[PDB]
């Protein structure tokens, strides 16, 4: 997989590595899941999420 295509399958940030290698990353206040693509909040108020809406569907 490559970052330029489909975001390398990453939810957030993507890094191409030497070989057929790819590494996904997450913004501060998030952690990367075992799927190696998904980001989950680690804090109460992570960036770019709307609390009242997150709650609205929680």
């Amino acid at each position: 997989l490559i970052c330029v295509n489909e975001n390398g399958g990453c939810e957030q940030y993507c890094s191409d590595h030497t070989g057929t290698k790819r590494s996904c990353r997450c913004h501060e206040g998030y952690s990367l899941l075992a799927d190696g693509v998904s980001c989950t909040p680690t804090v109460e108020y992570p960036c770019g999420k709307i609390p009242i809406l997150e709650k609205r569907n929680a």
């Binding site: 975001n7 939810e11 940030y13 993507c14 913004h27 108020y45 960036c47 709307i50 609390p51």
Partner: protein, 250 residues
């Protein structure tokens, strides 16, 4: 904001209101607890720097509901490449005197990685712009925070479709040419926010235009992607005496 709607309270939690001597100046975007991104041009005519106030958790200007958080602006950082009275390199990084407290009503917008922004975010058609700016060309400003969904144009296309500053590589066009929908005076410095896979990111800064909602013209936005590294470096830096700081760009 012209031709938008009221942003329901708390749904625009990264939106900042900038005040000078209690008067509406410009918008801004919270990117973390002490940092706000705005537009350079907003600070041209600033007399006394020490009277600059940033308000978070604002919604309805007519009332106080207790969700509001006001902070003194400790530092205004502008790129070296910005020339007062012009439109290029229309970005400012503001350091708050004290952090805001994150709440349901006060949340930062994610400052994306450049690559991500360029390769992915840049291709998301629609994004949200917001502010307490003029509701109409030559009109009154908004009492309630307004928001508007605008589509992004490739610059080649913007130029093609427009009918005077160049649209530089440090800019992008977004909106409509039918004179119905735009950002306007008072909105400048505010966010152009882009959704991707359940999260919102800062892609633009409300900057300028050929008037507001002028037929045959689009809204012009500061291309934030060009500035990620610049911003990041500054955020890692120690404060300096004196409010205004001109920092080299790149």
């Amino acid at each position: 904001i012209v031709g938008g709607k009221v942003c329901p309270k708390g749904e625009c939690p990264w939106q900042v209101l900038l005040l000078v001597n209690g008067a509406q100046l410009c918008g801004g975007t919270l990117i973390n607890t002490i940092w706000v991104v705005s537009a350079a041009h907003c600070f041209d005519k600033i007399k006394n720097w020490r009277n600059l106030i940033a308000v978070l958790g604002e919604h309805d200007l007519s009332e106080h509901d207790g969700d509001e958080q006001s902070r003194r602006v400790a530092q205004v950082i502008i790129p070296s490449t910005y020339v007062p009275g012009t439109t290029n390199h229309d970005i400012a990084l503001l350091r708050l005197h004290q952090p805001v407290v994150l709440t349901d009503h006060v949340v930062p917008l994610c400052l994306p990685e450049r690559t991500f922004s360029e390769r992915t975010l840049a291709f998301v058609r629609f994004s949200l712009v917001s502010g307490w700016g003029q509701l109409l060309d030559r009109g009154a400003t908004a009492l309630e925070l307004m928001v508007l969904n605008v589509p992004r144009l490739m610059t080649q296309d913007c130029l093609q479709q427009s009918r005077s500053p160049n649209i530089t590589e440090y800019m992008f066009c977004a909106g409509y040419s039918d004179g119905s929908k735009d950002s306007c005076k008072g909105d400048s410095g505010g966010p152009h926010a882009t959704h991707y896979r359940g999260t919102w990111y800062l892609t633009g800064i409300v900057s300028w235009g050929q008037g507001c909602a002028t037929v045959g013209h689009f809204g012009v936005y500061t291309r934030v992607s060009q500035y990620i590294e610049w911003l990041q470096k500054l955020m890692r830096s120690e404060p300096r005496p004196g409010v205004l700081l001109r920092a080299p760009f790149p």
